[PDB]
Amino acid sequence: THQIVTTQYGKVKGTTENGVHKWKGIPYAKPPVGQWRFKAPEPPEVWEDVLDATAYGPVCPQPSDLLSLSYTELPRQSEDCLYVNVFAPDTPSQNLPVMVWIHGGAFYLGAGSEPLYDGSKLAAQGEVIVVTLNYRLGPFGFMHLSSFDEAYSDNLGLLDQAAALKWVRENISAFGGDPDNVTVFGESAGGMSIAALLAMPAAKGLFQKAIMESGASRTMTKEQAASTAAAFLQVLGINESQLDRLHTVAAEDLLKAADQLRIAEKENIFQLFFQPALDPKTLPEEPEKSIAEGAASGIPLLIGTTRDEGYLFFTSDSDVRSQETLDAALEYSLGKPLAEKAADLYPRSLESQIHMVTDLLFWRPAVAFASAQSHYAPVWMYRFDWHPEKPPYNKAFHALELPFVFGNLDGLERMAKAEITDEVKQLSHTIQSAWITFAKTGNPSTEAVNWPAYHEETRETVILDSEITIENDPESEKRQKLFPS
Numbered sequence: 240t241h242q243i244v245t246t247q248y249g250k251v252k253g254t255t256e257n258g259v260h261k262w263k264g265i266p267y268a269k270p271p272v273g274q275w276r277f278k279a280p281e282p283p284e285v286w287e288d289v290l291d292a293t294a295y296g297p298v299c300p301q302p303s304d305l306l307s308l309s310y311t312e313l314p315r316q317s318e319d320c321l322y323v324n325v326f327a328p329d330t331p332s333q334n335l336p337v338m339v340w341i342h343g344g345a346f347y348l349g350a351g352s353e354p355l356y357d358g359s360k361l362a363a364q365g366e367v368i369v370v371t372l373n374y375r376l377g378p379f380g381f382m383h384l385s386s387f388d389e390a391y392s393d394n395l396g397l398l399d400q401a402a403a404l405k406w407v408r409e410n411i412s413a414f415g416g417d418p419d420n421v422t423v424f425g426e427s428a429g430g431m432s433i434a435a436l437l438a439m440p441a442a443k444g445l446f447q448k449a450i451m452e453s454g455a456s457r458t459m460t461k462e463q464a465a466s467t468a469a470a471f472l473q474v475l476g477i478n479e480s481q482l483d484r485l486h487t488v489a490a491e492d493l494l495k496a497a498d499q500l501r502i503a504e505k506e507n508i509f510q511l512f513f514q515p516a517l518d519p520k521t522l523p524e525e526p527e528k529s530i531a532e533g534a535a536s537g538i539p540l541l542i543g544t545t546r547d548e549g550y551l552f553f554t555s556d557s558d559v560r561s562q563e564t565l566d567a568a569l570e571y572s573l574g575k576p577l578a579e580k581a582a583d584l585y586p587r588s589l590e591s592q593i594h595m596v597t598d599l600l601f602w603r604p605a606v607a608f609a610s611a612q613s614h615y616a617p618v619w620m621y622r623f624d625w626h627p628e629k630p631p632y633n634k635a636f637h638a639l640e641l642p643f644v645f646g647n648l649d650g651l652e653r654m655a656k657a658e659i660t661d662e663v664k665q666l667s668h669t670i671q672s673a674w675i676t677f678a679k680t681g682n683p684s685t686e687a688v689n690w691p692a693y694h695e696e697t698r699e700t701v702i703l704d705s706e707i708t709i710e711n712d713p714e715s716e717k718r719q720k721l722f723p724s
């Protein structure tokens with residue numbers, strides 16, 4: 240019970256608190272600094288002594304936008320941030336299911352060690368092992384420089400995630416987990432990351448189940464990645480013959496250059512900037528297309544969205560964008576005729592731009608991905624509708640389901656100033672129980688919900704709220720407008 244575990248790179252020692260074994264700050268890669276900046280993750284150097292794993296490692300450098308809201312006491316920031324944390328229930332049971340969390344944050348914010356993602360409650364209540372991790376963000380993980388040097392890798396942040404999953408496959412049995420029953424789950428950018436991981440060469444065979452919360456196929460073109468990369472170096476004053484400077488410039492300067500590029504670009508309604516990029520070596524094609532062709536055959540998928548995603552993207556006082564902007568977003572998302580028709584579904588207004596974000600950034604992608612995967616594996620869909628009744632937090636905002644999934648309800652106070660009532664505790668128990676049962680069997684059904692499989696003929700969907708219900712082909716009129724006739 241003293242919790243010393245031998246990893247492939249050396250021994251680590253954790254602790255036990257309230258029935259949960261915990262190991263924090265375990266290195267899964269060599270710190271991506273200096274010459275290793277902008278390169279694929281390398282194995283960390285081995286150590287012969289016992290590494291103290293009772294404190295979280297640093298988080299990736301980033302603006303304080305999310306950290307200030309997520310933490311009461313800000314964490315240390317460093318490019319040396321590639322660490323995983325393990326939470327396991329103190330039980331005689333072996334070969335436990337493993338749930339690996341990929342945090343959201345628009346690919347430039349967040350950390351696996353944010354208070355909201357503490358896996359103690361999930362591990363204890365479900366008797367599963369929970370793994371959280373950090374991956375390179377912003378200019379460190381999603382600045383695709385392959386166009387300047389083949390030695391550099393694009394989609395660095397995704398490669399870090401894959402490296403962490405590889406670490407889990409090779410080391411989790413030593414922590415009491417089943418390396419052959421690994422469920423990867425994530426929200427927002429984390430869900431979008433999982434869409435990519437389900438198709439990436441780097442992640443082949445590294446997990447057996449997936450949960451995608453408010454996130455699906457999302458990428459920028461190879462051309463867009465290259466143009467942004469060139470603009471980035473220009474801001475830094477680095478020439479094609481001064482690439483060595485990319486490994487010496489201060490991290491703070493990389494962040495400043497990144498922030499400078501954003502402000503220079505008129506913000507879009509989806510607030511998209513950093514994101515995965517198409518690249519022959521790391522992400523050959525759009526995740527949705529790859530899944531539609533069977534790249535994730537046999538991998539059960541639990542996927543969903545919140546009813547009011549878009550309300551977190553605007554304020555009642557936000558400016559109303561032009562019709563041309565909305566039509567541009569429609570063409571981008573939909574296509575040629577799909578944009579033409581159904582365009583009348585979003586007449587200029589604050590309401591329409593809110594609905595467009597919910598529909599085009601989250602709902603349509605989720606339905607498209609779920610439908611595609613339904614031909615190759617069991618799929619289960621949900622729509623989260625819960626929220627406090629009193630304004631102004633009376634909307635099922637993007638990310639509002641997170642406190643329920645992890646069981647860390649203090650997060651609801653900062654997200655919606657909501658009180659932890661019996662209804663809230665009950666809903667968290669129901670949602671967490673479903674996530675756990677899915678990790679264990681590939682079917683999210685519980686005593687509170689007999690979940691119907693999602694397929695294109697009936698599109699049966701579970702509605703998560705104080706009272707669980709099922710809707711058959713929800714928002715059918717909207718679906719018919721957003722998809723080919």
Ligand SMILES: [K+]
Pocket residue numbers: 240241242243
């Ligand atoms: K022991």
